[PDB]
Structure formats: C-alpha cells, structure tokens
Amino acid sequence: PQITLWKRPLVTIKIGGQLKEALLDTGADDTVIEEMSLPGRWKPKMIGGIGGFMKVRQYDQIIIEIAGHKAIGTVLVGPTPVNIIGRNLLTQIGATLNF
Amino acid sequence: PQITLWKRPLVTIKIGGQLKEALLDTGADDTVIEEMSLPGRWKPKMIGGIGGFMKVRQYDQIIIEIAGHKAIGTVLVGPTPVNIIGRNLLTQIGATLNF
Numbered sequence: 001p002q003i004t005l006w007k008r009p010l011v012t013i014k015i016g017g018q019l020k021e022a023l024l025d026t027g028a029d030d031t032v033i034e035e036m037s038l039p040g041r042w043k044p045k046m047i048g049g050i051g052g053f054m055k056v057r058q059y060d061q062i063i064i065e066i067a068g069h070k071a072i073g074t075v076l077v078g079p080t081p082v083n084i085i086g087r088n089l090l091t092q093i094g095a096t097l098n099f
Numbered sequence: 100p101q102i103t104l105w106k107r108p109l110v111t112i113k114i115g116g117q118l119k120e121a122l123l124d125t126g127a128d129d130t131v132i133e134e135m136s137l138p139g140r141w142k143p144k145m146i147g148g149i150g151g152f153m154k155v156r157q158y159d160q161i162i163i164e165i166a167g168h169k170a171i172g173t174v175l176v177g178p179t180p181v182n183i184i185g186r187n188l189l190t191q192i193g194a195t196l197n198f
C-alpha cells in the first residue's frame with residue numbers, strides 16, 4: 001500500500017497467535033511491543049526516547065505478521081504505550097518513505 | 100525521492116535561518132527541534148513518548164524547509180537529543196510510506 005500520514009499509520013500485526021494494533025514508525029530503530037508472552041530466552045536492553053529510558057526484554061527471531069507481510073526478527077517487550085514497528089522490521093516488509 | 104530504512108532517515112532542514120539535521124518520523128505526531136530561538140509567541144506543552152513526557156515550547160506558524168520542500172506548521176522546541184519531523188509536517192511535503 002501507499003500510506004499517507006494525515007492519521008497515525010496504524011496496522012494490524014499478528015504475534016504469538018494474537019492480533020494487535022501497531023504503529024509503522026520510521027523514527028524507531030527497534031520494534032517494541034506491550035507486555036506479552038513470547039517463547040525462548042530474552043536478553044536485556046535499555047531503549048531511550050522522548051521522555052527518557054525504558055528497560056525491555058529482547059527476544060530474537062520472533063515470527064510476526066505486519067499488515068499481512070511476514071517478518072521474523074527482534075522484538076522488544078516492555079511497558080510501551082503504543083506497539084511500535086521500527087526499522088528492523090520495516091525493512092523486512094520492504095517499506096520506504098517517498099515524497 | 101525514495102528513502103530506504105536501513106539507516107535512520109535523516110535529512111537537512113532549514114528552520115529559523117539555521118540548517119539542522121532531522122529525522123523523518125512517521126511515528127511522531129509532532130515536530131520537535133532541539134533548543135533554539137524562534138520568533139513570535141509560544142506556549143508550554145507536554146508531549147509523550149517512550150519513557151514518559153517532555154516539556155517543550157510550542158511555536159505556531161513556523162516555516163521550515165525539509166529536504167528542499169517548504170512547509171508551515173507548529174514546531175515544538177525542547178531538550179530532544181534528535182530533531183524529529185513528525186506527521187504534521189510530513190503530510191505537507193507529500194510523504195508516504197510504501198510497501
């Protein structure tokens with residue numbers, strides 16, 4: 001699709017069998033999803049943005065569908081206010097910015 | 100132009116007579132620039148992101164050139180470590196996300 005930006009670019013994702021809403025975010029390096037159960041071991045990560053830092057759980061090699069497009073990659077889990085699809089997965093779905 | 104997302108989508112902007120680097124940020128509602136003076140009136144605002152909230156100054160009707168494309172809108176000024184061009188100005192330059 002071609003997504004304009006008059007509204008937030010929210011899409012459906014599927015992760016852990018579950019549908020969620022998430023924001024397609026070119027400003028985010030990483031993908032951050034609200035607290036949920038994911039399989040396997042996790043590693044620590046500290047992320048930062050506009051109001052400071054957040055500790056998250058880093059899970060690697062997670063299967064995730066984004067607006068119908070399949071990705072397999074790193075998902076950070078933590079108390080984020082919005083599920084964010086960052087560039088690590090935007091690149092897997094072939095997304096670009098155009099003007 | 101078409102901008103891929105392997106790296107942060109940074110572009111040159113001109114604001115307040117100054118050249119700066121800024122991030123094209125589809126996940127940001129607002130445009131937020133590091134501390135600088137701008138003409139005219141302003142009012143305080145609190146904006147949210149990962150980590151909580153940041154206090155900023157809100158300046159309206161500010162012209163900005165973004166990668167060569169003129170736009171006008173609200174610009175927030177505060178202690179951001181990265182200048183961000185959010186949707187309020189991305190729309191004005193005709194930016195879309197494509198996949």
Ligand SMILES: CC(C)(C)NC(=O)[C@@H]1C[C@@H]2CCCC[C@@H]2CN1C[C@@H](O)[C@H](Cc1ccccc1)NC(=O)[C@H](CC(N)=O)NC(=O)c1ccc2ccccc2n1
Pocket residue numbers: 023025026027028029030031032047048049050081082084086124125126127128129130146147148149179180181183185
């Ligand atoms: C997600 C993470 C990997 C931590 N990356 C970032 O957060 C980087 C950090 C960079 C350095 C600091 C300055 C911002 C830039 C860009 N951000 C990405 C950037 O796209 C970021 C992602 C985001 C969206 C929604 C909620 C939280 C976080 N957006 C923002 O910080 C913008 C700022 C604004 N008010 O316009 N936030 C929002 O547009 C926004 C929208 C809805 C919300 C609901 C509840 C609480 C907060 C909400 N914030």
Ligand SMILES: [Cl-]
Pocket residue numbers: 072073074088089
């Ligand atoms: Cl990844």
Ligand SMILES: [Cl-]
Pocket residue numbers: 171172173187188
């Ligand atoms: Cl505006």
Ligand SMILES: [Cl-]
Pocket residue numbers: 004193
């Ligand atoms: Cl349009």
